[PDB]
Design a protein around this ligand. Structure first.
Ligand SMILES: CCc1cccc(N2N[C@H](C(=O)O)C[C@@H]2C[C@@H](N)C(=O)O)c1
Lengths: 281, 273
């Protein structure tokens, strides 16, 4: 069939979620319909499917893919988990929706990695990402592998740097740089917005996170005080990719369509439309 | 059977040096004390020694997935484009693409750019290196970059080109928005990146549009050269395999694993940065 269940996850500017237009009670132009299962309370599986309206960088990718590869879809937001985590060998998030066949496709800020690639097929990456570093303008650091991060107490004063815990960034640092992980947990940030405030107010020296997210934030930062390292020093370079069921018959044509979008300028136009900001390091 | 690896001379990803008298490779260590792993590569009929970024990757892939290999350099010295067969209908690929589709090679291990044109016929790994296109000039030449009047309004006074039968040659011919630039480029394109880089050093070539991971390495080694510092198009290198090859999945998983455990970080610090 050409009708596809597709799961997504809110993370601006890649996926932005709005309510239906109250006047028409439909999704306005620029946006596509998406449904979210909303719980009655935290003490039940009972809930109500609520109509919402989704837009953003990856939603525009989905529209291009649906037009080019010729398929229709029902888009819905994941409600258990976020991107995808294996908890006691059971997947949640968007990856969980794909592996357990509730969705044939996951569209969003979904990072390609080896663990997920053993249970889903990933399209070609459509934007690059990885582990990058954001600092206040004037701070000199190379990247995640900088000795100022690896051996923080070789310097006086030591760098105050951290990440948002419980995600792919913390897991990677924990495996690659154990002491750096042990050190930086004292500077754990509750969220991206918290970290930016801590950077701009001198409470934090560096923020280590998703490169695509950090580049977007730096491009629109006010006064352009926050900057990221160069793209050549991004650690563990990977990308956002479309997740599909293992052995999906949609993977090849989706790969060819994405590579077409990259080569013919359509991809750069979406980057200009959604990702590029005033600031330019 | 041994896997037939095709590659191409492209520093710092593939160095090609002559063997010693006894047919072996001179033992070397990096300035930081790491052993430089070298393999024998046959090329144009004569054995030579190959090493560098992609050779380090090939060794890691061979031991991870437990396969043996033999390395040879691409016979025609090109990466690979599709050309019409004269007085015929068929199209054929040249360069490493043709050798992979012919069976002369089982796997391409080189700075092979992933694009839609090649992915129609072969399977690409996940990218082992993210980079892009930039412009290399000689120190003393001043241009804004890709959107320069000297490049947008070409003439025989400012000669710019790329490598024939390459990803960049594909990129500028397929786009109707680049038809004026490509017409200037097709009468000046060089057979190799090395010949084009030296031409910028002999002031015969004034600009060279090529891969950033190569051009930026060239600027850091030959300070009489300099790049724009701009990335006007981003692309990735991938391992090339035939359709439905038995190694596709584990090569991609191996590469993703190498990015995540810092192995590619080590390759970058050793060869690129
Ligand atoms: C090499 C490790 C790495 C490479 C590229 C991105 C990240 N990320 N860091 C975040 C976090 O730790 O919460 C979220 C994001 C992952 C998120 N897109 C996802 O798909 O899980 C980690």
């Amino acid at each position: 069939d050409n009708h596809l269940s597709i799961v997504t996850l809110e993370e601006a500017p890649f996926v932005i979620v709005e309510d239906i237009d109250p006047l028409t009670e439909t999704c306005v132009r620029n946006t596509v319909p998406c449904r979210k299962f909303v719980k009655i309370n935290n003490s039940t599986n009972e809930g109500m499917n609520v109509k919402k309206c989704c837009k953003g960088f990856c939603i525009d990718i989905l529209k291009k893919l649906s037009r080019t590869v010729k398929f229709t879809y029902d888009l819905y937001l994941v409600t258990n988990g976020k991107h995808g985590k294996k908890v006691n060998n059971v997947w949640n998030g968007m990856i969980g929706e794909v592996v357990y066949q509730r969705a044939v496709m996951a569209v969003g800020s979904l990072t390609i990695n080896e663990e997920r690639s053993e249970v889903v097929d990933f399209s070609v990456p459509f934007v690059e990402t990885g582990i990058s570093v954001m600092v206040s303008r004037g701070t000199q650091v190379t990247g995640l592998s900088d000795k100022k991060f690896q051996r923080p107490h070789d310097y006086s004063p030591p760098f105050r740097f951290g990440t948002v815990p419980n995600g792919s960034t913390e897991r990677n640092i924990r495996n690659n740089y154990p002491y750096m992980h042990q050190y930086m947990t004292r500077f754990n940030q509750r969220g991206v917005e918290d970290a930016l405030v801590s950077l701009k107010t001198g409470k934090l020296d560096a923020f280590i996170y998703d490169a695509a997210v950090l580049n977007y934030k730096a491009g629109r930062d006010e006064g352009c005080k926050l900057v990221t390292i160069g793209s050549g020093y991004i650690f563990a370079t990977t990308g956002y990719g479309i997740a599909l069921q293992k052995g999906s018959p949609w993977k090849r044509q989706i790969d060819l369509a994405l590579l077409q979008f990259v080569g013919d300028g359509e991809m750069e136009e979406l980057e200009t439309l959604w990702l590029t900001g005033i600031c330019h390091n | 059977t041994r896997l037939k690896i095709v590659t191409i001379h492209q520093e710092p990803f593939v160095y090609v040096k002559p063997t010693m008298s006894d047919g072996t490779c001179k033992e070397e260590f990096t300035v930081n004390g790491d052993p430089v792993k070298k393999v024998i590569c046959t090329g144009p009929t004569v054995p030579q020694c190959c090493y560098g970024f992609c050779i380090d990757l090939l060794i890691k892939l061979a031991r991870t997935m437990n396969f043996t290999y033999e390395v040879h350099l691409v016979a025609d010295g090109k990466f690979g484009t599709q050309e019409r067969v004269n007085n015929s209908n068929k199209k054929e690929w040249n360069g490493m693409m043709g050798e992979l589709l012919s069976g002369q090679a089982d796997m391409i291990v080189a700075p092979l750019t992933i694009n839609n044109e090649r992915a129609q016929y072969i399977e690409f790994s996940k990218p082992f290196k993210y980079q892009g296109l930039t412009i290399l000039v000689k120190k003393g030449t001043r241009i804004t970059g890709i959107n320069d009047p000297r490049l947008r309004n070409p003439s025989d006074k400012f000669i710019y080109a790329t490598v024939k039968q390459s990803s960049v040659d594909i990129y500028f011919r397929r786009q109707v928005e680049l038809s004026t630039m490509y017409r200037h480029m097709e009468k000046h394109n060089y057979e190799s990146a090395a010949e084009a880089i030296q031409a910028v050093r002999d002031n015969k070539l004034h600009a060279f549009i090529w891969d950033s991971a190569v051009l930026e390495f060239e600027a850091s080694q030959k300070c009489d050269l300099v790049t724009t510092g701009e990335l006007f198009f981003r692309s990735g290198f991938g391992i090339g395999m035939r359709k439905d090859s038995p190694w596709k999945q584990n090569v991609s998983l191996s590469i993703l694993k190498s990015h995540e455990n810092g192995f590619m970080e080590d390759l970058d610090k050793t060869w690129v940065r």
